[PDB]
Design an enzyme around this catalytic site. Structure first.
Site, short mmCIF file in Angstrom:
data_model
loop_
_atom_site.label_atom_id
_atom_site.label_comp_id
_atom_site.label_asym_id
_atom_site.label_seq_id
_atom_site.Cartn_x
_atom_site.Cartn_y
_atom_site.Cartn_z
N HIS A 41 0.80 -1.22 0.00
CA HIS A 41 0.00 0.00 0.00
C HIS A 41 0.85 1.29 0.00
O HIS A 41 0.29 2.38 -0.16
CB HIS A 41 -1.10 0.04 1.07
CG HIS A 41 -0.60 0.22 2.48
ND1 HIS A 41 -0.12 1.43 2.92
CD2 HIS A 41 -0.59 -0.66 3.51
CE1 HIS A 41 0.18 1.26 4.20
NE2 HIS A 41 -0.09 0.01 4.59
N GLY A 143 2.54 5.97 10.30
CA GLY A 143 3.95 5.85 9.95
C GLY A 143 4.58 4.54 10.39
O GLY A 143 5.72 4.25 10.01
N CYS A 145 3.56 1.52 9.60
CA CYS A 145 3.43 0.43 8.63
C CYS A 145 4.78 -0.08 8.18
O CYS A 145 5.73 0.69 8.06
CB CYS A 145 2.57 0.85 7.45
SG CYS A 145 0.92 1.41 7.95
O1 LIG Z 1 -4.18 2.00 9.15
C1 LIG Z 1 -3.35 2.65 8.53
C2 LIG Z 1 -3.49 2.95 7.05
C3 LIG Z 1 -4.39 1.95 6.36
C4 LIG Z 1 -3.85 1.01 5.49
C5 LIG Z 1 -4.68 0.08 4.90
CL1 LIG Z 1 -3.99 -1.12 3.86
C6 LIG Z 1 -6.04 0.04 5.16
C7 LIG Z 1 -6.59 0.97 6.05
N1 LIG Z 1 -7.92 0.85 6.45
C8 LIG Z 1 -8.17 -0.20 7.43
C9 LIG Z 1 -9.64 -0.55 7.44
N2 LIG Z 1 -10.45 0.66 7.66
C10 LIG Z 1 -11.55 0.57 8.43
O2 LIG Z 1 -12.10 -0.51 8.67
C11 LIG Z 1 -12.15 1.79 9.01
C12 LIG Z 1 -11.72 2.88 9.70
C13 LIG Z 1 -12.88 3.63 10.04
C14 LIG Z 1 -13.93 2.97 9.55
O3 LIG Z 1 -13.52 1.83 8.90
C15 LIG Z 1 -10.11 1.84 6.85
C16 LIG Z 1 -8.62 2.07 6.85
C17 LIG Z 1 -5.76 1.94 6.62
N3 LIG Z 1 -2.25 3.17 9.11
C18 LIG Z 1 -1.88 3.04 10.46
C19 LIG Z 1 -1.28 1.90 10.98
N4 LIG Z 1 -1.12 1.65 12.29
C20 LIG Z 1 -1.54 2.56 13.15
C21 LIG Z 1 -2.16 3.77 12.78
C22 LIG Z 1 -2.64 4.72 13.72
C23 LIG Z 1 -3.25 5.87 13.30
C24 LIG Z 1 -3.41 6.13 11.95
C25 LIG Z 1 -2.96 5.25 11.00
C26 LIG Z 1 -2.33 4.03 11.39
#
Ligand SMILES: O=C(Cc1cc(Cl)cc(N2CCN(C(=O)c3ccco3)CC2)c1)Nc1cncc2ccccc12
Ligand SMILES: O=C(Cc1cc(Cl)cc(N2CCN(C(=O)c3ccco3)CC2)c1)Nc1cncc2ccccc12
Ligand SMILES: [Cl-]
Lengths: 302, 296
Positions: A41, A143, A145
């Protein structure tokens, strides 16, 4: 004596962490030999959040689009390929700090150390378990990831997890190092929910054996249980079923403490019914499930 | 999101661990520059040491035997001068920490790192570590930027299973002596400033159930703290928590009122950050570092 949530020493993995930048996105990569592994990603733009076509996005990239930084040195990307949800960037330099390593896919209940990283730089190390619902309860910010989970046996690093995302509940999802997600998750920002989590029963039993080895017996009782009656009770408290494999796995700790597995199961049933009544077990007022039988033997015996 | 008991990355310290054997005893040593530091009990220590030759100390760094060319004692630590400076010596300092301060321990056996865990120097000067026989000489440290601050060297285990040791200058933490004689850890207390920091960490992570509308005075809070075997909260502690107070909107005495209610009423079946006990092994600095992602 003592019992701590203990992580593996992280030095062998620290010397593998690099920063991968593609466009506006920066995350961590794992540099082993002449390959940098990272979440695919990293090639997504703001328009590729919900339904990215990674094959189509990747075909449009040149090697020079991937900026890889190892410490203060920019590495040269000379090739790229995707394997499931991981991107493999071939570089012109083999990592001189590459340890002896293996890629291992783990099962729910298994534990591992996580080296949390930001911008290719290690921030901390902590101990994790793959939950029965295939998520991990990590500590990760934006960050993080590409940060990895691992175990060490002898001088060999078994890489078992690469961090990809945080679910709405604050729990984390990722892949093995072959890019296969743990759990029914996809590397899309489409709404995804972790299934109802349960307690890792075999790990709770291992930790009760750790408590007995460390001198605590208050929770033991004069009863035993059949495996089936235990499972009928345990399931009512959202505990994972205990299998005959788990009973066999607990054999060594049973032999060491003199407490049969099904006798420890009866102790667990009683704790579930009564709670701790102001007492603690190994400094915890909750039943701990992130120590495996193998962790208990390693920490208590060597 | 998430909040874990997190240790510093241990690589800088791993490249310093060596095995020290003297007679029948084998333990760990810390090799920095051309000196190997280890517990003097590996050996009336002045009388026992004067009888030793350099070749009596077998020092192994990986698969290489180092040559000891001198030996001297500083308090309860033995300093073995070696003929080779450790090429992996990081930027380092020796620092003595105070009760309540946290550090990472790199547990070692036979000069080989086995695990890393985070712990706090208890108010009774012991550490609730996890150590088996052979772990002596394992060290505790903090990292600031690229500088390792070594703050602890493991010497012994007390009857309650807790651990005692020294700073890297060989001065014991607590009223302990390095003699094979029964010694008891004093009654321990809870590190109040750390519990408050961890409650701020819980708020930052979305756990607010324990918050209340009330505030208290520092004096009334300390009267309640004394009653529950909690360490006194000082104005320095209040000032230290200032940043977390400003970030969450919960004044330190407002969090103190939440803590007082938790102490008098319990958690009522609830948990905070996955714990049914109030956690006191995260400092205010640890909370800020983890909840903001500082790297080394
Ligand atoms: O989670 C991503 C980025 C990221 C990558 C990928 Cl491959 C997918 C996705 N999704 C995952 C699934 N999804 C949901 O189910 C959702 C959220 C709200 C409603 O539904 C949407 C986003 C998000 N980064 C981060 C990694 N670790 C910690 C972080 C703590 C703060 C912020 C980011 C962080
Ligand atoms: O504690 C020593 C060795 C050692 C070194 C020195 Cl400088 C002094 C002493 N003693 C003075 C303190 N003391 C007691 O108060 C005590 C315990 C039981 C009854 O009394 C123990 C004897 C013991 N090693 C070890 C270090 N860490 C973990 C170990 C876990 C298993 C076994 C040994 C371990
Ligand atoms: Cl597994």
């Amino acid at each position: 004596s003592g019992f701590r949530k203990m992580a593996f020493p992280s030095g062998k993995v620290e010397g593998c962490m690099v920063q991968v930048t593609c466009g506006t996105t920066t995350l961590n990569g794992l540099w082993l030999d002449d390959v940098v592994y990272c979440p695919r990603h990293v090639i997504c733009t703001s328009e590729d959040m919900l339904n990215p076509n990674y094959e189509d996005l990747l075909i449009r990239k040149s090697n020079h689009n991937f900026l890889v930084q190892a410490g203060n040195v920019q590495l040269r990307v000379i090739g790229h390929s995707m394997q499931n949800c991981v991107l493999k960037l071939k570089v012109d330099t083999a990592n001189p700090k590459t340890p002896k390593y293996k890629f291992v896919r783990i099962q729910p209940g298994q534990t591992f150390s996580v080296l949390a990283c930001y911008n290719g730089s290690p921030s901390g190390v902590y101990q994790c378990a793959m939950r029965p619902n295939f998520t991990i309860k990590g500590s990760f910010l934006n960050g993080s990831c590409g940060s990895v989970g691992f175990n060490i046996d002898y001088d060999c690093v078994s890489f078992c997890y690469m961090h990809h995302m945080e679910l709405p509940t604050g729990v984390h999802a990722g892949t093995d190092l072959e890019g296969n997600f743990y759990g029914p998750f996809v590397d899309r920002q489409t709404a995804q929910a972790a299934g109802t989590d349960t307690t890792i029963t075999v790990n709770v039993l291992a930790w009760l054996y750790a408590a007995v080895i460390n001198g605590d017996r208050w929770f033991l009782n004069r009863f035993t249980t059949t495996l089936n009656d235990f499972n009928l009770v345990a399931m009512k408290y959202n505990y994972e079923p205990l299998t005959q494999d788990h009973v066999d796995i607990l054999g060594p700790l049973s032999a060491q403490t003199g407490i049969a597995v099904l006798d420890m199961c009866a102790s667990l049933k009683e704790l579930l019914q009564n709670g701790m009544n102001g007492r603690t077990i190994l400094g915890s007022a909750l039943l701990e499930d992130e120590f495996t039988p193998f962790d208990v033997v390693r920490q208590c015996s060597g």
